[PDB]
UniProtKB/TrEMBL annotation:
Transmembrane segments: none annotated. The keyword Signal applies. It holds the Pfam family Alpha_L_fucos. This is Glycoside hydrolase family 29 N-terminal domain-containing protein. Residues 216-352 form the Glycoside hydrolase family 29 N-terminal domain. One of its GO terms (molecular function) is alpha-L-fucosidase activity.
Amino acid sequence: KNVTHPYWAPKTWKLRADDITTIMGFRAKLKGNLNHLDRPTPTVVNNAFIRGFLTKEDVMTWEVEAPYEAEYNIALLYTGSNDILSESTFEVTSGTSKIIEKANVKNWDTRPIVQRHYLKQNLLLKKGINKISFRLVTFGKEKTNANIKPNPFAFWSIELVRPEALVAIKERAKEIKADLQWMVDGKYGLFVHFSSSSVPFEGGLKLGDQYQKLVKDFDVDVFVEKVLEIGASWVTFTCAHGTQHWPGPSKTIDSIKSGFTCERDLIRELIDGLGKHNIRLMLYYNPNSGMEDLYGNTYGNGDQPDPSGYFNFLEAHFREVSLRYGKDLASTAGYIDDGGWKVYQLDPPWEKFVKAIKAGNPNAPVGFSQNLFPNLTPFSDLVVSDGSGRVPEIQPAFLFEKGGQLEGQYPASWFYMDGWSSRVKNGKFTQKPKFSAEKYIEIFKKADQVNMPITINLAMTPDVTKGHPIFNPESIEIMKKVRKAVKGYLE
Ligand SMILES: [Mg+2]
């Protein structure tokens, strides 16, 4: 039943002794009813969970390679019905080491939906090849307000780190942690999707089909005046949303495949345009969308999977961009998309990415989108996920305490008023705002009261010119009232 392309097939995992190593559940050999959605091509499959932990025989077994004997702390990532978790007991074994612990009940209503569970007892691993097994030994089941889809115990990944390496890791995470006071004081910012799939206002090919032209015609002063009108204190600008087109020079991208960069350094002109008004610029970057047409498969070609080429492209890219603009750019990683669903599954070197992001700007906030997952890496700065058009969740305080799901991160909200990508048909915007201006005022007012920065998206036409509104005027009108209620004079 279970299908895995050789790049995703179970295999022996080299443990990095000074580091957190993460191993996806599908990389273990599976017995019994344990199953996962098919993974037939080299392309990552988001829904990687392992399901089927119904009996004491549904066992999964990893083969790890510990360079020497040592005690590793174990973390499990899983989700499922709280009625199942309330009566589920884990068993982690290797050789004669045997950890037994009850599951944690999710006692918060917000994200993260998947939880990270640090087991109390450590795990001895011999030198060389080890076999690590995971299974349930006691079982809950779902109880009786009436839906259809079940919510079984679903296993995502196992994590292993020597407790000495963990303390040292957290020490360096603390030493480079970003100061987000400029974001708290700014109160809110603008998310702008320069999406490769958006159709121009005036008609024509989508952005990803005439990218260089639209970058040459982009009017920075038209854009900066609308940003300044709505009160935004920063802009998170979409690079490579849907394709790997990048709105400026890049020796790293050019070195993989030509055609994706621009002669016009639009990033530079956005920095200088916005900076006349003390408005900062952070980048969105998508490391998967259209990557097959730039780098190819994340794990390469040839018989066996090798991510190192992919990882180096990312590190060099983050580094070059960070150095090219320096402190002038607030961050080249304000929003790195699908850090959780996609990047996490390759077991990436998070620290190298982060050191690359901060190389030119040591206060650059790093925001890997963790989707519905807990903190991706101790080196995160911001909570990052896609809020669609909903009221922002207030994540309870205890998630951010030591041990917590989100320890080390600072709350932040990312969502849209009308839509993510503009959908303009016949010179009229087709995505209206979701809420009344009064509700948005309440949203922004509460986020200000709790010092949670907000980055709201207003859908934008990709042809930024003088000819037409680039933002939905209803959306703009709402945001002008928001600016009055939150950033204007109060008495
Ligand atoms: Mg505040």
